[PDB]
Amino acid sequence: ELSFGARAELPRIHPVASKLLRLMQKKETNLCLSADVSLARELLQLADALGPSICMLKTHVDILNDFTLDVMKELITLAKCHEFLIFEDRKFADIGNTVKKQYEGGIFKIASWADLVNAHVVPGSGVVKGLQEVGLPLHRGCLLIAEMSSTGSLATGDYTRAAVRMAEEHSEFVVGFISGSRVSMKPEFLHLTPGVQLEAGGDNLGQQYNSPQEVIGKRGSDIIIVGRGIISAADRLEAAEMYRKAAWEAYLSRLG
């Protein structure tokens, strides 16, 4: 196993993955904050406060009651200052011709500010081909959803293998996976894992949790994505630090 810093230098590494891996090593963080909030001011307050603790800020911009592109311009300022990537968790899942427009255009212009986006592989590889027509000129990366954390997820078995093959065949744009475990043995690919909290449990709508030690240490993922585990805490700074320390120490131990 190679350190994040060494993986940042791999010959076939995507530039977006390399940037992320370098800041992960620099800041000792493999925590992605899931900034699931309804107001621009809350998104920016949390990004600023927790910026030092995170390698990545994951957005759902379609849940912002007061989105404007100015909010995203300000988010990019915070990203540059604190050194984290912005990942819009849009889960593109349409035919290639459609996702191209949903990525570049409309009100959100996602490709104009998101370093990373993700996509479901269910439509076939056209979903990647469409996104990459916009993504490649704008120097962006994409994560493919190989597994889901939720109860009854169909992203298993042959479906997961399909996601890996699609990633391999689109490595100029696809930088890795959303998954519950390592799904590829190629160290150029990133693994990001949501459904993470320190304590066992779930929510009332299908979410299931595993701990940072299980996910990073035993399951070989790179980055934990944490929402309510941090946001619902009384002290979000302390919470972000506990998750960062948990995921980082789990990564160090796996590294030996």
Ligand X SMILES: Nc1nc(=O)n([C@@H]2O[C@H](COP(=O)(O)O)[C@@H](O)[C@H]2O)cc1O
Pair 58, 35: CB distance under 8 Å: yes
Q: Which of 220, 194, 179, 251 is nearest to 33 (CA)?
A: 194
The pair of three-digit structure tokens given for residue 219, joined into one six-digit string: 């399951």
Q: Of 19, 94, 129, 245, which residue is the catalytic one?
A: 94
Of residues 95, 138, 237, 255, which one binds ligand X by CB under 6 A? 95
Find the helix or strand (DSSP H, E) in which 247 lies. helix 236-255
DSSP characters for 40-101? HHHHHHHHHHHGGG-SEEEE-GGG-TT--HHHHHHHHHHHHHHT-EEEEEEEE-S-HHHHHH
Q: 190-193 and 174-178 as β-strands: parallel, antiparallel, unpaired?
A: parallel
Candidates 150, 171, 181, 213: give the one binding its own copies (CB under 8 A): 150
Known catalytic residue at 94? yes
Kindly identify the residues of this chain, within the stretch 195-214, that bind ligand X according to CB under 6 A: 195, 197, 207
Q: Pick from 46, 166, 226, 240: which binds ligand X (CB under 6 A)? A: 226
Residue 34 in marked binding region: yes
**Is 239 a binder of ligand X (CB under 6 A)?**
no
Give strand pairing partners of 225: 32
Helices H, strands E: what count in the chain?
10, 8
178 near ligand X, rule: CB under 6 A: yes
Residues 3, 45, 98, 213: which binds ligand X (CB under 6 A)? 98
Which run of H or of E encompasses 209? none
Q: Is 145 in the site for ligand X (CB under 6 A)?
A: yes
Determine whether the annotation assigns residue 222 to a binding site: no
208 annotated as a binding-site residue: yes
C-alpha–C-alpha distance, residues 53 and 17, integer Å: 18
> Does 62 qualify as catalytic in the annotation?
no
| Residue 55 Cα distances to 25, 73, 177, 194, angstroms | 9, 19, 16, 14
Judged by CB, which is closer to its own copies: 17, or 174? Answer: 174
Beta carbons of 190 and 221 less than 8 angstroms apart: no
Rounded Cα distance between 179 and 160, Å, is: 9
Task: Pick the binder of ligand X from 72, 82, 229, 251 (CB under 6 A).
Answer: 229
> With CB under 8 A, what is the number of residues at the site for its own copies?
51
Site membership for its own copies, residue 15 (CB under 8 A)? no
In the chain, the N- to C-terminal Cα span, in Å, equals: 9
- Which residues are known binding-site members for UMP? 34, 36, 58-60, 94, 98, 149, 207-209, 227-228
Q: Annotated active-site positions, please?
A: 89, 91, 94
- Which residues are known binding-site members? 34, 36, 58-60, 91, 94, 98, 149, 207-209, 227-228
Binding site for ligand X (CB under 6 A): 34, 36, 60, 89, 94-95, 98, 145, 148-150, 178, 194-195, 197, 207, 225-229
Binding site for its own copies (CB under 8 A): 36, 38, 60-67, 89, 91, 93-98, 100-102, 105-108, 120-127, 129-130, 133, 145, 148-155, 159, 162, 203, 205-207
